[PDB]
Amino acid sequence: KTQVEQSPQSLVVRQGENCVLQCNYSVTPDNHLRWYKQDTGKGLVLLTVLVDQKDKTSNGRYSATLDKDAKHSTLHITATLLDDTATYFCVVGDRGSALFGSGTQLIVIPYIQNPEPAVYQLKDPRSQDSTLCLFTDFDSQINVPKTMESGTFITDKCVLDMKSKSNGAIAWSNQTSFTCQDIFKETNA
Amino acid sequence: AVTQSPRNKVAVTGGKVTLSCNQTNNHNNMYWYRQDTGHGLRLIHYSYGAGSTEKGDIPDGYKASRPSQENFSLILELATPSQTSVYFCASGGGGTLYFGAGTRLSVLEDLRNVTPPKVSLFEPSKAEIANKQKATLVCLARGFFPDHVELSWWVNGKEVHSGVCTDPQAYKESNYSYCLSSRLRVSATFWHNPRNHFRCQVQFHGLSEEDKWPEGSPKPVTQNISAEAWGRA
Numbered sequence A: 001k002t003q004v005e006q007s008p009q010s011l012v013v014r015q016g017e018n019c020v021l022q023c024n025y026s027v028t029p030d031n032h033l034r035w036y037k038q039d040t041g042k043g044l045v046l047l048t049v050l051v052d053q054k055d056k057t058s059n060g061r062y063s064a065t066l067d068k069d070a071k072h073s074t075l076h077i078t079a080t081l082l083d084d085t086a087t088y089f090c091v092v093g094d095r096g097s098a099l100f101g102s103g104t105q106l107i108v109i110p111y112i113q114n115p116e117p118a119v120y121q122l123k124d125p126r127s128q129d130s131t132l133c134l135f136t137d138f139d140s141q142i143n144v145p146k147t148m149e150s151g152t153f154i155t156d157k158c159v160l161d162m163k164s165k166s167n168g169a170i171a172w173s174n175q176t177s178f179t180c181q182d183i184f185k186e187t188n189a
Numbered sequence B: 001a002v003t004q005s006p007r008n009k010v011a012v013t014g015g016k017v018t019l020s021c022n023q024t025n026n027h028n029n030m031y032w033y034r035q036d037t038g039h040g041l042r043l044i045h046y047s048y049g050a051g052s053t054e055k056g057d058i059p060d061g062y063k064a065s066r067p068s069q070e071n072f073s074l075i076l077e078l079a080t081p082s083q084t085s086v087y088f089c090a091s092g093g094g095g096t097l098y099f100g101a102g103t104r105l106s107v108l109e110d111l112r113n114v115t116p117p118k119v120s121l122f123e124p125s126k127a128e129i130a131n132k133q134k135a136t137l138v139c140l141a142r143g144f145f146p147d148h149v150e151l152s153w154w155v156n157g158k159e160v161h162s163g164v165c166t167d168p169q170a171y172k173e174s175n176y177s178y179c180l181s182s183r184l185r186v187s188a189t190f191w192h193n194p195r196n197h198f199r200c201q202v203q204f205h206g207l208s209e210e211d212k213w214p215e216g217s218p219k220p221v222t223q224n225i226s227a228e229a230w231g232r233a
């Protein structure tokens, strides 16, 4: 039975929104509690260290609380940025006795002021007849369909930033019949 | 200052695997963790100083060794599929953990399914270019196993990050086959220039030198596989 539990388990929030993560534990000793952030395929980065029976910390957009009586902690992220997309771990205790929670997966999605959804077919010049579909510039609430067919594959939405932002998904199939129009059932094929 | 090696490893069930951690922090404490979905990081073994080690929370099937202040090794004497995971080592001074970059380990029943990706670069749609004055190139890596890959884009010989979106996880296409996709978006003007060179590269981490390869087909060693295109007006 795990001794550190976190909520939400996962959440997808719109950029600029605040969010609150929670952790509670049954582990003793609990001299310190820490929150860590882990990006896609990255190492962990320490966000804050809480130590006192009732404690409160501030680190830029992060603020955190600790109530050792309740064995409870919260981490508040003010005004989320896309770069806040990551897993947040609560870690209780020290050194060899430290225990990690299973994490909260946070995803931050942008507001697209002017979506222009379009589906494009692209060709691979190194393979005769090899193509793929690109669904792009759709709004952030739009549902990208999952494959209902064998030999056809559709990726999850991927958010791209040129440094405007664009949502995109890709699909490919080994089926003679089916084209880009029947795969992405939104508009502009 | 905390360096793990190897960063990727493919082993066969019953084989031996050693992961090494070398730190330059002069920290007395070191730690080996594994990360698994639904478990966060779990401590396997740790050490409070050169010459000794301690069992962590899930030590079974692993040994550890701390021959010096700098080095902390994790030993799997008889690898099992259950040991497939991402491993992190860390050093510690005064409570804070300093983590290594991570090691992907896959323990397989046999090495015959290990296979590098086929990489394809799909060129931008003329409709996208005409209508949005932007050009999205798509790279697709297919047919690889296990999923120890890194996809990167190179424009004019330099790695690029802006305008790139890569799948954060490879998609399992079939039981022994993964896929991964990525998009690079540039302005139409940039795509339209003949000087510009675009390359999608996939670093596939596979078998090492000591691995037995009993086939007529090429040994699936660690390798870079790329596809490229040139701008055109």
Ligand SMILES: *[C@@H]1O[C@H](CO[C@@H]2O[C@@H](C)[C@@H](O)[C@@H](O)[C@@H]2O)[C@@H](O[C@@H]2O[C@H](CO)[C@@H](O[C@@H]3O[C@H](CO[C@H]4O[C@H](CO)[C@@H](O)[C@H](O)[C@@H]4O)[C@@H](O)[C@H](O)[C@@H]3O)[C@H](O)[C@H]2NC(C)=O)[C@H](O)[C@H]1NC(C)=O
Binding pocket: A002, A003, A004, A005, A024, A025, A026, A070, A071, A072
């Ligand atoms: C993390 O915290 C949760 C929530 O618990 C609260 O928050 C913490 C910080 C403390 O302040 C607690 O005192 C708070 O209650 C814990 O879950 C709770 O665990 C306690 C036991 O420690 C449970 O209490 C039991 O409840 C039994 C009846 O439960 C049923 O009915 C209630 C109706 O309200 C329902 O909510 C519940 O789902 C059951 O169907 C009771 O018979 C028994 O005697 C005892 O009082 C409590 O029910 C739990 N709450 C919930 C919502 O499930 C976690 O255990 C804690 N995790 C860790 C690792 O510490």
Ligand SMILES: *[C@@H]1O[C@H](CO)[C@@H](O)[C@H](O)[C@H]1NC(C)=O
Binding pocket: B203, B222, B223, B224
């Ligand atoms: C592949 O490319 C990377 C980065 O460009 C390079 O550092 C690495 O050595 C290459 N891998 C192999 C096995 O050649």
